[PDB]
Amino acid sequence: PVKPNYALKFTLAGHTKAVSSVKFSPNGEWLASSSADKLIKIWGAYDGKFEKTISGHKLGISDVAWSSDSNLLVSASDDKTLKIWDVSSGKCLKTLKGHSNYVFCCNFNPQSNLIVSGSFDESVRIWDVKTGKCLKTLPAHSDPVSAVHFNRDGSLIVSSSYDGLCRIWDTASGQCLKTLIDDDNPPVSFVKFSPNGKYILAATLDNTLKLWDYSKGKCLKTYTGHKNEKYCIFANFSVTGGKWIVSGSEDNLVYIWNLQTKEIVQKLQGHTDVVISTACHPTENIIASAALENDKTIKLWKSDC
């Protein structure tokens, strides 16, 4: 497919402050969103129907992530905790305590027995899902940790930071295996592994996305043209149809690039504030996007490819 043809299907209203993160459940049925309003909301992925509000954090939430079972959710909050939730009941099952400042980012491993978190306290923590105990505290960075993500089998973690670094960690040992550096050292605002685990996609606050072979320390692709100088905006690989890179942007648009050619293939217009977060549906050509305070909505878009 030359280009996708994403078109607006639903606008989901409900959050009372800026939205921070949206994530589709692994089985595709649900979208979860988090907000500065201290709430998590669950929505139907296909009809955009509000399902429920999940509450309990004492301050704003910066990120949410789903277990492989599509029922457990973890949230990362400014109240210095993460919470694990049973989405079917909406109950908090446990509170993960240990970070000394805002928890900014979180993720389950594929096995879904561990959670990784990054914090303004400059550490990465690895948590036991069953006991709620902190297993390891990694002295990962020298400034706030903007993203943390497990690779395809959970053996590795990638972390990014305002300190300008991306680091690859061995999960089992907590050892740093690789540090990626840029001579001009821009803050790294987001990172994640490619679906195949071989690459990392890293956002820096100089309006640039970069695809790296981290083992070789080699940058393979750069995606530009969007606006990203201020916020930690999520980016994604879209793999259900055409192979795309998808990101939010500080000009209120969703950008979509051809992964190989690096060309912008679509820009999705409709939000009225910074698109802080986007997510790609696991099986369908569906994107969820979410925006800041002037907007406060989540949009669902659908493409033929």
Binding site: A36, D78, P187, Y231, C232, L292
Partner: peptide
């Protein structure tokens, strides 16, 4: 925090 700007240039 994510909804606020917290980074150096």
């Amino acid at each position: 925090a994510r909804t606020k700007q917290t980074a150096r240039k």
